[PDB]
């Protein structure tokens, strides 16, 4: 049996997002790529740099917001600015984001040397697409 | 203790600087204007010659050098509000359509004071010009800051 | 904190073999040609001998950068294949789909 | 009535037929001049109102790339010409004129012309290790009837 | 904005130099992606881009690459067991034709500056230029 990044079934009580619900088969099918850049395409370069950034920026977004994340965050690379897309729940108050916005984009611009912003889109709780 | 020898010391200063060849600029002119705020009434006749002789030395007025005259010509605390000047009218013709860029440490203070003054003329004609001023340009740039941006 | 001890000594090999490498290139220069006389190939044969071992390149290895396993890594991202596995199961890579064919 | 470029001026000063006589830079910049541009700048400074305005505080910044792309912008190789890396063969004239070591500083200098991963200080610097290491084997070279310098 | 709109924007200023301008016989645009659905629309916007500055443009889809490898599916022995893995390569090529070099700048920025993420451009600039004035006449 296969046990690779598969939510396995409980007893109908288990919330699951949609990201999780999908097994790896269904990326490009049913679900995208949490991040886009160019290196994985045909003739590009920095591949393994690109990909290390962004194991490094999830864990970075996940200590900086514990517990505040509803989601995976989505990172998107144009040219050499990056964009972190996070799903935040409302748990902090609102001028506590201000200032992890503020450190956390600063710190990871003076870091990796590019322009870096952060969008967090609000939820009032984690969206649940099944129940499993 | 005497503002006519105030006055003319201060004249002494720019004779001076006529002797030892030096021009003078912007500040040099907003520094005076701003000075001449104390004394309302008497620095009026005063403060227009220093502005006719801005344009004859060449040096444009900026926002800043506005916002001094009007402060000297619509006081916040007047009690003669039943024959108020017309300099506002006047200044706003001049200025209808010019762009302006940051030349002084009280461009910003100008758009926040000159709608003040139309509140209390009660002239909505005047304050879309002074809106209509803001929206040319960049001019935008000039309102003001945190206090006099929701002051305006 | 590199991952292990074995990735603290290829670092240090790597790092080794760039300082060397204009070195190590003219003096293997001198050897691998049959204009110079071989008194001098035989010569510059010891010169290359004596540099320390750790700047010769061929004692690089290479290993994922985040477990330091010495086999079954990819050259495009510098990852083994079960690290490589688990952030493409994921949809983590950029572009990385299975193969359904 | 009150017009306001119409009337009586001082007259202290006069018309300014030389004007800006003395140069804006009299000296290099003071404390006191460079801090008075800066509070000027603030006169102005306003916060973001869109993204387009975001981009060009970051290109004026050098933050973000410019645009169309240039792949070396920035990079130029000691304002070099073709010609500097392609024709080295002046540098080779410390070397004997002919000989074993001629031919082999020709393939050298020959290789050196095809890199483009190397300046032309660099591109020297292989060439004048050459010529000290053969300075140092003369006497090995000359039992091999070769004479250097 | 119903009442309050801006009067007289500022525009950049453009100043026509004295050197001649590039001529650009051919502009070849080959854009690259993971998914077709954003060339379409990039191709879209470049295409309508193009037309409205008076550019002469042309489009066609190379064929498209796709690159696939196998792993070791366990991490311990069971080698008999694999999984493959692919990356999908998709292309667009705007052909632009007859462009000087202002035109060429201004648009590449354009389209370059709104180059949707996952998206890489590989711009082919063709110039004609005349011979070099020793070559126009024999000199021995
Ligand atoms: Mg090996």
Excluded at chain 2, 91 to 103: A, D, H, V, Y
Excluded at chain 5, 41 to 46: G, K, L, R, V
Excluded at chain 5, 99 to 122: D, F, H, K, W
């Amino acid at each position: 049996k296969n046990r690779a990044a598969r939510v396995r079934v409980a007893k109908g009580n288990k919330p699951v997002s949609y990201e999780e619900a999908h097994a790896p088969h269904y990326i490009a099918h049913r679900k995208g790529w949490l991040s886009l850049h160019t290196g994985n395409l045909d003739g590009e370069d920095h591949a393994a740099e690109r990909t290390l950034e962004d194991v490094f920026l999830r864990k970075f977004m996940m200590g900086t917001f514990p517990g505040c994340l509803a989601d995976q965050i989505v990172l998107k690379r144009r040219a050499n600015q990056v964009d972190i897309c996070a799903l935040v729940l409302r748990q902090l108050p609102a001028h506590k984001f201000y200032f992890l916005v503020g450190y956390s984009e600063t710190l990871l611009s003076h870091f990796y040397k590019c322009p870096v912003r952060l969008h967090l889109q609000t939820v009032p709780s984690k969206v649940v697409y099944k129940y499993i | 203790e005497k503002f006519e020898e105030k006055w003319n010391d201060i004249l002494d200063l720019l004779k001076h600087m006529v002797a030892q060849k030096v021009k003078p600029n912007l500040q040099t002119f907003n520094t005076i204007l701003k000075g001449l705020r104390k004394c309302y009434s008497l620095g009026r006749i005063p403060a227009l010659q220093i502005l006719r002789e801005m344009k004859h030395i060449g040096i444009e007025p900026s926002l800043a050098t506005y916002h001094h005259i009007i402060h000297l010509f619509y006081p916040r605390d007047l009690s003669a509000i039943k024959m108020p000047s017309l300099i506002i009218y006047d200044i706003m013709n001049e200025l209808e359509g010019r762009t302006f860029s940051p030349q002084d440490l009280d461009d910003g203070r100008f758009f926040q004071l000159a709608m003040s003054v139309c509140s209390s003329l009660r002239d909505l004609e005047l304050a879309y010009q002074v809106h209509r001023l803001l929206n040319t340009g960049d001019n935008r740039k000039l309102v003001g800051h945190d206090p006099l941006r929701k002051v305006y | 904190y590199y991952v292990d001890w074995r990735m603290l000594r290829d670092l240090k090999r790597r790092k080794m073999a760039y300082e060397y490498a204009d070195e190590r290139l003219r003096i293997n220069s001198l050897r691998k040609n049959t204009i110079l006389p071989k008194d001098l190939q035989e010569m510059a044969g010891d010169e290359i001998a004596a540099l320390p071992r750790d700047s010769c390149p061929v004692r690089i290895r290479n290993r994922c950068v985040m477990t330091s396993r010495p086999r079954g890594v990819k050259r495009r991202w510098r990852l083994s294949r079960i690290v490589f596995r688990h952030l493409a199961d994921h949809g983590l890579l950029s572009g990385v789909q299975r193969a359904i064919w | 009535r009150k017009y306001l470029f119409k009337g009586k001026r001082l007259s202290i000063f006069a018309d300014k037929a030389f004007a800006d006589e003395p140069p804006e830079p009299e000296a290099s910049p003071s404390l006191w001049e460079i801090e008075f541009a800066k509070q000027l700048a603030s006169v102005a400074d306003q916060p973001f109102e869109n993204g387009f305005e975001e981009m060009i505080q970051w290109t004026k910044e050098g933050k973000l790339w410019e645009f169309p792309v240039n792949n070396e912008a920035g990079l130029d190789d000691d304002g070099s010409e073709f010609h500097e890396h392609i024709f080295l063969d002046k540098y080779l004239e410390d070397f004997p004129k002919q000989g074993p070591i001629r031919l082999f500083m020709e393939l050298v200098t020959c290789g050196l012309s095809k890199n483009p991963y190397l300046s032309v200080k660099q591109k020297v610097e292989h060439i004048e290790w050459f010529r000290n290491y053969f300075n140092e084997k003369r006497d090995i070279l000359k039992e091999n009837n070769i004479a250097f310098t | 904005l119903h009442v309050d709109v801006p009067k007289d924007v500022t525009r950049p200023t453009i100043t026509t130099s004295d050197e001649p301008d590039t001529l650009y016989k051919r502009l070849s645009i080959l854009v690259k992606a993971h998914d077709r659905a954003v060339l379409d629309s990039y191709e879209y916007f470049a295409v309508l881009a193009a037309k409205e500055l008076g550019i002469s443009i042309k489009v066609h889809e190379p064929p498209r690459k796709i690159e696939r490898f196998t792993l070791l599916k366990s991490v311990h022995i069971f080698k008999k067991h694999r999984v493959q893995y692919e990356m999908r390569t998709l292309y667009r090529c705007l052909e632009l034709k007859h462009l000087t070099g202002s035109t060429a700048s201004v648009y590449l920025e354009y389209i370059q500056r709104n180059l949707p993420e996952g998206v890489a451009m590989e711009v082919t600039k063709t110039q004609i230029q005349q011979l070099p004035e020793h070559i126009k006449e024999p000199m021995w």
